[PDB]
Design a binder for this molecule. Structure first.
Ligand SMILES: *[C@@H]1O[C@H](CO)[C@@H](O[C@@H]2O[C@H](CO)[C@@H](O[C@@H]3O[C@H](CO[C@@H]4O[C@H](CO)[C@@H](O[C@H]5O[C@H](CO)[C@@H](O)[C@H](O)[C@@H]5O)[C@H](O)[C@@H]4O)[C@@H](O)[C@H](O[C@H]4O[C@H](CO)[C@@H](O)[C@H](O)[C@@H]4O)[C@@H]3O)[C@H](O)[C@H]2NC(C)=O)[C@H](O)[C@H]1NC(C)=O
Ligand SMILES: *[C@@H]1O[C@H](CO)[C@@H](O[C@@H]2O[C@H](CO)[C@@H](O[C@@H]3O[C@H](CO)[C@@H](O)[C@H](O[C@H]4O[C@H](CO)[C@@H](O)[C@H](O)[C@@H]4O)[C@@H]3O)[C@H](O)[C@H]2NC(C)=O)[C@H](O)[C@H]1NC(C)=O
Ligand SMILES: *[C@@H]1O[C@H](CO)[C@@H](O[C@@H]2O[C@H](CO)[C@@H](O[C@@H]3O[C@H](CO)[C@@H](O)[C@H](O[C@H]4O[C@H](CO)[C@@H](O)[C@H](O)[C@@H]4O)[C@@H]3O)[C@H](O)[C@H]2NC(C)=O)[C@H](O)[C@H]1NC(C)=O
Ligand SMILES: *[C@@H]1O[C@H](CO)[C@@H](O[C@@H]2O[C@H](CO)[C@@H](O)[C@H](O)[C@H]2NC(C)=O)[C@H](O)[C@H]1NC(C)=O
Ligand SMILES: *[C@@H]1O[C@H](CO)[C@@H](O[C@@H]2O[C@H](CO)[C@@H](O)[C@H](O)[C@H]2NC(C)=O)[C@H](O)[C@H]1NC(C)=O
Ligand SMILES: *[C@@H]1O[C@H](CO)[C@@H](O[C@@H]2O[C@H](CO)[C@@H](O)[C@H](O)[C@H]2NC(C)=O)[C@H](O)[C@H]1NC(C)=O
Ligand SMILES: *[C@@H]1O[C@H](CO)[C@@H](O[C@@H]2O[C@H](CO)[C@@H](O)[C@H](O)[C@H]2NC(C)=O)[C@H](O)[C@H]1NC(C)=O
Ligand SMILES: *[C@@H]1O[C@H](CO)[C@@H](O)[C@H](O)[C@H]1NC(C)=O
Ligand SMILES: *[C@@H]1O[C@H](CO)[C@@H](O)[C@H](O)[C@H]1NC(C)=O
Ligand SMILES: *[C@@H]1O[C@H](CO)[C@@H](O)[C@H](O)[C@H]1NC(C)=O
Ligand SMILES: [Mn+2]
Ligand SMILES: [Mn+2]
Ligand SMILES: [Mn+2]
Ligand SMILES: [Mn+2]
Ligand SMILES: [Mn+2]
Ligand SMILES: [Mn+2]
Ligand SMILES: [Mn+2]
Lengths: 93, 924, 690
């Protein structure tokens, strides 16, 4: 019905990343990008990007450590959670 | 104050119908008659299969207090299919909002439900009905192809409605777009002309409506209440709507242009959950022709005397000015849980004072939740905040609170008495009450006593019953009566005269009327119009010298008038009331001749002296200015002597000095009238010869604009004597001084740095703070304390940049708080950045100087300079004598170069301070 | 010589009792005249005049019931006593004041009642993980502070009416989830589920059964549940002499009062208990949401503490809501960090970290003053509350009670209690106004002289127009027959001008805008001192040119305020510890400090300079904060010694200094992560060698 996914990886440099996905097909206020190390490791950081753009960009320099990302599409009005479901990828540096 | 509470008009609908939930006036253009419109949203109807459909009744004021329902729909709902109701009139609350302009009336059903045309549902779009005499059209803007909660499906349009002077309907609804709310406006003529009974969603041309917004604005409840008025240059009313759940429940009031829906102005509540914007109103209360805003917050909580939180409700009063910037004042409720700001109703100008007046109701206040309505008169200064009258509804409680208030409509003259009347609805008891205003007669009275100085031995006129010579005088008193609106041609007053009112209280009666032989006399009088003052001549004599101990006490003639009320033919009865602030009586004093000399007339020599006491008063502060006055009478006795102290402008009276034994406790009063504010003090009645008095008078002087140089006081003694009745005019001034205490403070964070430094690796080409050293931050504050203010000042910083070609404290970036610009003689961050004890000052090292321009630091405000620097670790150790105690001394100087007040002698203000950062070694 | 008593109250007995509390009265008509009867203290003892006939009521404050403060919250105690004393009898003569004291103690092992209000709306299906465990885990971290605690819970969704609920096709009535191709439960108002009991197994079993319902209106209106769980004592099972905790959880914002008008609900919340035997809110459809004020009022009446446990997004909202309902705390609900386990105990710690006295049924005629002794006889004045407390601490309050006149009453009563506790101090109020021998008067005429006269205990005064020592006055007035010293000295004119002096007793009414009285009529009662456009600032009466200020007002102009609330800072300490509160506005006393709460201090010692005193206090046991025994009270910041490790770094302040031992101590502290004072001190500082 309504959800993120079709998650690609477009631009690759020695560091950072670029992530692109497909729209949830419903009106979206914005998105929330969440990422962290694999396993049961340290808590995850999150930022925000607008809803009219299908891309995102993040900075920083870290090794791979089996990195995995998540992106939160926040759509909710009325009594319901403002999200659909987290989806993810797995990529290494 | 002119509303008549003894005999109002009471209208009652069927119980349980919420009769009185909405009220308005019906004044048709086709008839000279007027009617009361009362909404009853829970009333049962003859409509087939409709339970509690609601209705609006037309109540006749003429007689019988009979109310008849106005027929709008009278039909069932509709059908989408065989058994598929296309709408639901059951419990639709029709009549919950009723408004009427001229011959047009508009009633709405905010709980009307739809099902739309796509899928089975029940969506409270709401609907209205507009009817002019014969034809009835249905108006449902929120009923459209935009559905569900995302669209207008839950809008409940018709929750609040209003008309403009251009015959344009303003209609709000809270439920549009997930309860963001919406305002929709349409031309009345466009509504009727475009109405097609076979089309459920009607597109209207020239429709002004707000659109959906971001979901952050959801659950705002825009359109909970609406009002109309013009706040821009055009004459066309602009839209005003309270939105109580907006701004994270603080509450807001939106103002939109009448031309297009563009936003104009905003208001915001200062307290959460207070429901700021539950009720709104627009009137001009100061008579300045600019409409002024009234916002209700019935759930607002102020703080009592003990400081605890308590819900009294609050009403916001915003006065529109020429520029458009509102000057807003707030007033609070009185009883807790009374919900003071529940209903704000403009009643027009009730008193005909020339300024409109307004009514505010607390429906759950009063005696045991009966309800109460406060009315407030407006004036030139804006709305005066005190009830000039209280309307306390008296009705029992059956099921729910008999809410007196919660529904009001004023600003219409139903009795044609020339005075607007007021309707207060009470849906708890299913009743509506109509209060009628009163003509407000303003009576001007005067009293003059003949030969006010009585000669004991002048026995001229005597006719007391086989006369014997006695001292006589005449008492003349005149009476003027005039008013506005309809009121009888002639009025009847009852006058009461009392002689020597000071006496007769356990004391001898010192004066009698000639014919009556009594201290008191009364007479019935009749006046017609203004300037028609009718007087009467009575002769009152003075009893024989041996009949009493005489007195120096004056004989006070006391006149009091009554004006018994028989007026207002038919219409039960309507009693005109006197003016709000009017004297109920007047007094005038006569004196017995004593020690006036061989001339038989007392001619006093009055002189008033004054000493400077404090020579200086400073500009920005409030000062304890005390004036010592010397009042002397070197002549014969002066009757009714008074000390006149003229205090101009900023000066306001405090009191008299009771603590001093050398000074007098003389009673003084602060009197303002005839565009003149001043202080009056009793010097004695009479003030006897050779009297000398000393008393101090405390005041507080702030300022008037600026550069007024000194301030002038005017002192004069005056008396009621026929000759030499005044002293000269002695004026005393005190110079205003400029004193502003300015201090300069500084700190260093940290105070010290302990070498060696953890994780230190010297890099040939430094990159970040990690490659340079720790962060030393100097903060300098220039604060103005003293009462005065300075317009411009300079600030000089001396930074120890380098010592022997190597950097000591490397400055990265400096910020400024307050009105200050700064400049560095050396470039900050030349290399850029990412993010015994030996004293080192700028004198003994290389100086990086920072010069700052400062301006306009008032009494409270100050200016700050934050300097963030890195300690240069590479400089230390080495041949720098590794183990040595270094203190890094930065100096900061300030000088005040200008002041805003001119023509006032000034003195320069200068001072310095130093900030030290001590870098030392914990291990040697 | 002449005093305040002999210049006013010579008219009568009862009128003499109200001049000053020092005044007295003389009965026993033996040897009349020769002196004023209204004189004070031993001046009437100078003359013999000392039978039981002497009238000198003395204001008393006597302890009726004072039980000793309890130690533990077990059942073998007296009953349980957190307030000493309990009952005090107060007797007051007009315009007099007597003072008393009260001790309040937070007692250990005090039983705790916890009732859970859970949002079952569809937005809470994501946050429903927190309801699991609970009663099993709820107990574990509560076992430290309190044995014998009882838990229970109830649920709320929204009002089952207009838009809030789904009136859509009938299959959505039974199953509000038809759209979204899922099935959920039908919605309801507040629903009581489990009464407070002992068994945690009964709790967890009943808790897991709970599922989510659906409504379309984003605010869920849990205030309906809060109001009912507070006012319904039997259904909830709130105990007495036990801490009452009402914990509130929701995914999103809430309805407030007057929101129900959209649903067609015009009836205000009555604050009564409408929960029936079916455990449902009957009036949920019929009456509006409760206002904050009514919630605040009923919350304190039942001594119930409200706790907000909400999602991180909506935390700041309910955090701001809590400020309007004093005594309520907010906490973050998240799957990481502390969460429910250490959350509630911290919230219960905050509630017990403050002691403030609330006054119920205080009569209008008298006012109360409070000096607070919290930390080792610090006697902080003007404050009725003590902050920064732990369970087991005891605080003291000195209270002054002053009545203005007396409204000829029999007895009244008011209660002084700490907020959130059953233990209370009841004060019985009685006023001594009438003379004891006033009742002995036989009311009829002819009792004094020539018939047609008045009388009292040791008093004869004739009637109007007669008005004499026995009976005679003006309308003859003879010669003055004396000056009667109508002035304090004979070289002065008639008594206070104002209608001269007649026939002995000076008569001067003049009827002009008030009442004028006195022996010489020196008391105007209208002419007084004014501050700004009003007499005594409208906050006080006027007696003989003096202002008697109303309750919560002091000063010569009566423009000074008792309130310390506007002096309180964001941290909760008045004037941020940088100044002292005077007349409702802080007067900052510190170098470079200013602001309303003295919160602004750009140039002053920063960070460590304050906290390095606390580490010497706590960790090194070294003084200058350990000398005044203010260590545990002032800085409650937890100090965890870290081994050699200053971490990679977060928002932090790295601080070093040299101690008495000439060793360099390095430490740092984290800022708020959900809020805390956490402080890390590096072990093994740097010292010289040898
Ligand atoms: C009294 O208080 C009122 C309540 O606060 C004030 O009303 C508010 O004024 C705001 C300022 O004008 C206004 O914010 C503007 O919103 C419009 C909405 O148009 C949009 O059109 C797009 C349709 O898809 C979407 O835009 C994108 O951006 C949003 C985030 O905003 C994304 O979430 C979307 O996915 C989408 O990609 C929106 O859905 C929306 O429908 C915006 O166009 C405005 O943009 C302005 O700022 C940007 C820079 O950020 C500029 O580039 C641009 O040129 C505009 O200047 C604003 O964001 C609120 O909507 C409005 N709310 C209400 C309820 O009226 C009122 O102004 C105030 N009056 C006074 C006198 O104080
Ligand atoms: C407009 O007309 C409508 C309908 O004509 C009318 O609504 C009706 O109101 C009555 C009473 O207010 C309702 O009758 C009730 O029915 C329920 C069962 O559904 C009963 O439980 C009610 O109470 C009874 O039982 C109690 C014991 O449990 C007794 O104590 C009590 O005395 C009763 O015996 C009650 O009988 C009726 O259902 C509605 N009809 C509807 C809603 O269609 C409304 O009052 C009218 N309003 C006005 C302003 O005229
Ligand atoms: C002894 O006492 C007698 C009274 O007991 C006294 O006779 C009074 O004399 C005064 C003046 O000497 C009279 O007052 C004036 O009388 C003239 C007569 O025409 C009036 O015109 C005057 O009118 C004034 O007031 C009007 C307003 O009402 C004004 O419009 C007008 O312009 C004047 O200002 C004024 O009344 C008074 O009337 C008599 N009284 C009697 C009862 O005759 C006598 O003078 C005393 N002896 C001595 C030596 O003074
Ligand atoms: C909305 O109505 C107002 C007045 O009727 C107009 O607002 C003008 O907007 C233009 C934008 O180009 C400004 O240059 C003018 O100064 C505004 N006039 C005002 C504020 O009085 C405008 O005609 C309408 N349309 C809008 C604002 O989009
Ligand atoms: C006569 O008029 C005076 C003033 O016009 C009134 O007496 C009092 O006036 C003050 C204002 O200065 C009011 O505050 C009081 O309420 C007034 N007293 C009363 C009893 O009304 C009053 O109208 C008249 N007073 C007398 C004694 O007749
Ligand atoms: C500069 O500020 C200082 C305060 O730092 C003030 O001087 C004080 O008073 C006298 C001067 O009248 C000095 O001798 C004292 O040492 C100062 N008191 C201190 C430092 O506590 C004054 O406002 C200014 N003084 C000068 C000389 O400009
Ligand atoms: C609070 O502390 C003050 C200490 O100043 C106590 O005593 C008052 O002190 C001054 C006179 O020096 C005045 O405010 C009062 O006259 C004093 N009160 C008396 C004598 O009762 C004050 O009593 C303390 N308050 C309480 C309730 O204990
Ligand atoms: C600082 O400079 C700006 C222009 O660069 C000027 O507008 C402002 O008034 C200046 N402020 C002061 C305090 O001089
Ligand atoms: C009243 O004054 C102080 C209040 O702390 C106290 O020392 C004194 O004992 C009090 N008096 C009585 C009778 O309690
Ligand atoms: C909470 O209140 C503070 C000030 O009291 C305000 O700055 C903030 O925006 C508010 N936020 C919310 C979510 O209520
Ligand atoms: Mn929800
Ligand atoms: Mn306009
Ligand atoms: Mn105006
Ligand atoms: Mn009228
Ligand atoms: Mn003379
Ligand atoms: Mn959730
Ligand atoms: Mn809801």
């Amino acid at each position: 019905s309504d959800v993120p996914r079709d998650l690609e990886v477009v631009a690759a440099t020695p560091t950072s990343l670029l992530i692109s996905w497909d729209a949830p097909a419903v009106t979206v206020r914005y998105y929330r990008i969440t990422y962290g190390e694999t396993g049961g490791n340290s808590p995850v950081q999150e930022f925000t990007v607008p809803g009219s753009k299908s891309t995102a960009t993040i900075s920083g320099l870290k090794p791979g450590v089996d990195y995995t990302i998540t992106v939160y599409a926040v759509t909710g009005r009325g009594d319901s959670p403002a999200s659909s479901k987290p989806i993810s990828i797995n990529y290494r540096t | 104050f002119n509303l008549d509470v003894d005999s109002p008009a009471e209208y009652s609908g069927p119980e349980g119908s919420y009769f009185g939930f909405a009220v308005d006036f019906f004044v048709p253009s086709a008839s000279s008659r007027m009617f009361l419109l009362v909404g009853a949203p829970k009333a049962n109807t003859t409509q087939p299969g409709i339970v509690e459909g609601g209705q609006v009744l037309k109540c006749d004021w003429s007689s019988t207090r009979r109310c008849q329902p106005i027929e709008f729909d009278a039909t069932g709902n509709r059908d989408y299919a065989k058994d598929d109701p296309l709408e639901f009139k059951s419990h639709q609350w029709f009549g919950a909002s009723v408004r009427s302009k001229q011959d047009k009336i508009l009633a709405c059903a905010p709980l009307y439900h739809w099902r739309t045309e796509m899928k089975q549902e029940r969506e409270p779009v709401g609907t209205c009905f507009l009817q002019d005499g014969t034809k009835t059209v249905e108006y449902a803007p929120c009923r459209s192809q935009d559905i569900d909660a995302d669209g207008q499906g839950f809008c409940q349009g018709g929750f609040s409605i209003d008309f403009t002077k251009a015959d344009r309907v303003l209609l709000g609804g809270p439920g549009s777009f997930y309860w963001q709310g919406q305002l929709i406006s349409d031309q009345v003529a466009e509504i009727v002309s475009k109405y097609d009974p076979n089309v459920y969603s009607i597109k209207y041309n020239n429709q002004l409506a707000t659109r959906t917004a971001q979901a952050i604005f959801d659950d705002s409840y825009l359109g909970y209440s609406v009002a109309v008025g013009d706040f821009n240059g055009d004459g066309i009313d602009d839209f005003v709507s309270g939105v109580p759940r907006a701004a994270r429940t603080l509450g807001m009031v939106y103002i939109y242009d009448g031309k297009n829906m563009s936003s104009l102005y905003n208001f915001t509540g200062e307290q959460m959950a207070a429901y700021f914007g539950f009720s709104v109103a627009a009137t001009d209360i100061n008579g300045d022709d600019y409409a002024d805003v009234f916002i209700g917050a019935p759930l607002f909580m102020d703080r009592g005397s003990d400081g605890k939180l308590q819900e009294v409700g609050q009403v916001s009063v915003s006065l529109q000015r020429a520029s458009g910037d509102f000057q807003t004042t707030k007033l609070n409720g009185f009883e807790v849980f009374a919900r003071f700001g529940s209903a704000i109703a403009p009643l027009g100008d009730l008193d005909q004072d020339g300024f409109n007046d307004i009514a505010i109701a607390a429906p759950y206040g009063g005696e045991d939740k009966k309800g109460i309505v406060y009315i407030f008169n407006g004036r030139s200064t804006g709305l005066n905040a005190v009830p000039s009258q209280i309307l306390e509804g008296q009705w029992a409680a059956r099921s729910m609170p008999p809410s007196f208030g919660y529904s009001m409509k004023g600003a219409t003259d139903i009795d044609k008495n020339g005075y607007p009347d007021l309707i207060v609805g009470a849906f708890g008891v299913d009743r509506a009450i109509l209060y009628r205003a009163r003509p407000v007669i303003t009576v001007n009275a005067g009293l003059e006593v003949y030969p006010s100085i009585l000669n004991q031995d002048n026995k001229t006129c005597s006719l007391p019953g086989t006369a014997l010579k006695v001292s006589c005088f005449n008492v003349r008193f005149c009476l003027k009566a005039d008013g506005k609106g309809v009121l009888p041609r002639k009025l009847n007053f009852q006058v009461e005269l009392l002689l020597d009112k000071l006496k007769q209280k356990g004391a001898i009666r010192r004066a009698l009327f000639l014919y009556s032989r009594s201290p008191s006399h009364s007479k019935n009088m009749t006046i017609s119009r203004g300037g028609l003052m009718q007087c009467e001549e009575l002769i009152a004599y003075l009893r024989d010298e041996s009949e009493f101990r005489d007195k120096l006490t004056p004989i006070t003639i006391f006149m009091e008038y009554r004006l018994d009320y028989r007026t207002a033919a038919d219409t039960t009865g309507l009693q005109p009331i006197l003016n709000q602030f009017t004297p109920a009586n007047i007094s005038r004093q006569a004196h017995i001749l004593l020690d006036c000399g061989e001339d038989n007339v007392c001619k006093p020599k009055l002189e008033v002296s004054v000493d400077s006491d404090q020579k200086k008063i400073y500009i920005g502060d409030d000062n304890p200015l005390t004036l010592i006055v010397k009042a002397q009478n070197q002549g014969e006795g002066a009757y009714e002597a008074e000390l006149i102290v003229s205090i101009p402008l900023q000066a306001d009276f405090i009191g008299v000095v009771r603590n001093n034994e050398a000074l007098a406790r003389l009673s003084c009063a602060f009197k303002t009238e005839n565009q003149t504010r001043q202080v009056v003090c009793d010097l004695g009645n009479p003030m006897k010869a050779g009297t000398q008095l000393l008393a101090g008078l405390r005041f507080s002087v702030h300022q008037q604009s600026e550069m007024d140089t000194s301030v002038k006081f005017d002192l004069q003694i005056q008396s009621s004597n026929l000759f030499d009745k005044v002293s000269p005019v002695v004026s005393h001034k005190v110079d205003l001084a400029v004193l502003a205490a300015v201090e300069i403070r500084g700190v260093s964070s940290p105070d010290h740095v302990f070498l060696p430094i953890p994780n230190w690796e010297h890099k040939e080409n430094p990159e970040t703070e990690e490659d340079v050293g720790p962060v030393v931050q100097h903060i300098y504050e220039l604060r103005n304390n003293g009462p005065s203010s300075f317009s411009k000042a300079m600030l000089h910083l001396q930074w120890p940049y380098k010592y022997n070609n190597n950097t000591l404290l490397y400055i990265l970036h400096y910020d400024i708080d307050g009105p200050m610009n700064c400049t560095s003689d050396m470039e900050i961050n030349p290399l850029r950045i990412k993010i015994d004890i030996h004293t080192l000052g700028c004198g003994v090292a290389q100086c990086l100087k920072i010069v700052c321009q400062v301006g306009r630091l008032d009494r409270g405000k100050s200016a700050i300079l934050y300097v963030k620097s890195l300690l240069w670790t590479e400089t230390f150790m080495n041949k720098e004598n590794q183990n040595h105690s270094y203190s890094l001394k930065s100096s900061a100087s300030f000088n005040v170069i200008e002041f805003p007040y001119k023509n006032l002698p000034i003195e320069d203000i200068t001072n310095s301070t130093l900030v030290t950062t001590n870098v030392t070694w914990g291990i040697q | 010589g002449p005093n305040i008593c002999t210049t006013r109250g010579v008219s009568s007995c009862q009128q003499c009792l109200a001049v000053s509390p020092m005044c007295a009265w003389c009965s026993d008509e033996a040897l009349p005249l020769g002196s004023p009867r209204c004189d004070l203290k031993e001046n009437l003892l100078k003359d013999n005049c000392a039978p039981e006939s002497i009238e000198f009521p003395v204001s008393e404050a006597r302890v009726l019931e004072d039980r000793p403060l309890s130690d533990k919250g077990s059942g073998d105690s007296s009953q349980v006593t957190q307030v000493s004393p309990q009952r005090i009898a107060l007797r007051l003569r007009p315009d007099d004041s007597k003072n008393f004291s009260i001790q309040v103690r937070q007692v250990e092992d005090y039983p705790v009642d916890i009732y859970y209000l859970m949002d079952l709306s569809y937005s809470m299906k994501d946050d429903l993980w927190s309801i699991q465990n609970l009663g099993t885990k709820l107990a574990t971290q509560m076992r430290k502070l309190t044995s014998n605690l009882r838990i229970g819970f109830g649920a709320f969704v929204d009002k089952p009416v207009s838009p809030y609920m789904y009136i859509s096709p009938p299959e959505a009535l039974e199953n509000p989830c038809y759209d979204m191709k899922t099935t959920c439960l039908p919605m309801f108002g507040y629903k009581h589920v489990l009464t407070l009991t002992d068994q945690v197994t009964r709790f967890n079993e009943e808790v897991k059964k709970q599922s989510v319902s659906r409504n379309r209106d984003a605010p869920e209106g849990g205030f309906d549940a809060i109001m009912q769980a507070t006012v319904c004592d039997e259904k909830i099972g709130w105990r007495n002499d036990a801490s009452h905790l009402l914990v509130f959880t929701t995914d999103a914002k809430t309805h407030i009062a007057l929101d129900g008008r959209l649903a067609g609900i015009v009836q205000p919340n009555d604050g009564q208990c409408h929960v029936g035997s079916d455990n449902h809110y009957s009036a949920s459809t019929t009456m509006d949401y409760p206002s904050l004020g009514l919630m605040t009022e009923k919350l304190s009446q039942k001594n119930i503490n409200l706790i907000f446990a909400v999602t991180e997004n909506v935390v700041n909202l309910y955090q701001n809501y809590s400020e309007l309902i004093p005594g309520t705390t907010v906490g973050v609900l998240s799957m990481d960090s502390s969460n429910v386990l250490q959350l509630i105990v911290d919230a219960y710690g905050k509630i017990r970290s403050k002691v403030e006295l609330e006054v119920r049924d205080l009569p209008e005629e008298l006012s109360l003053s409070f000096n607070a002794t919290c930390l080792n006889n610090e006697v902080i004045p003007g404050l009725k509350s003590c902050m920064g407390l732990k369970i087991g601490d005891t605080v003291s309050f000195s209270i002054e009670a002053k009545v203005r006149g007396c409204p000829q009453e029999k007895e009244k009563s008011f209660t002084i209690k700490p907020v959130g506790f059953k233990d209370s101090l009841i004060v019985q109020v009685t006023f001594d106004c009438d003379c004891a021998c006033q009742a002995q008067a036989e009311p009829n005429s002819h009792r004094c002289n020539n018939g047609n006269g008045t009388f009292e205990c040791g008093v004869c005064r004739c009637g109007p127009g007669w008005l004499g020592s026995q009976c005679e006055c003006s309308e003859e007035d003879y010669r003055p027959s004396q000056q009667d010293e109508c002035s304090p000295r004979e070289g002065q004119p008639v008594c206070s001008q104002r209608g001269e002096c007649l026939c002995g007793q000076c008569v001067c009414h003049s009827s002009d805008f008030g009442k004028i009285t006195g022996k010489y009529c020196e008391c105007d009662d209208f002419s007084c001192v004014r501050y700004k456009g009003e007499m005594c600032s409208g906050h006080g009466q006027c007696s003989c040119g003096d202002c008697l200020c109303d309750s919560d007002w002091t000063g010569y102009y009566c423009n000074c305020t008792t309130r310390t609330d506007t002096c309180m800072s964001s941290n909760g300490l008045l004037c941020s510890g940088r100044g002292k509160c005077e007349c409702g506005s802080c007067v900052c006393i510190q170098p470079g400090s200013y602001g309303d709460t003295c919160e602004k201090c750009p140039t002053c010692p920063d960070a460590c300079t304050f906290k390095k005193e606390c580490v010497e206090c706590k960790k090194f046991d070294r003084g200058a904060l350990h000398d005044e025994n203010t260590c545990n009270r002032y800085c409650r910041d937890e100090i965890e010694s870290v081994k050699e490790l200053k971490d990679t770094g977060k928002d932090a302040v790295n601080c070093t200094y040299k101690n008495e031992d000439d060793c360099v101590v390095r430490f740092q502290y984290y800022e708020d992560s959900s809020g805390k004072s956490i402080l890390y001190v590096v072990e093994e500082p740097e010292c010289p060698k040898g």
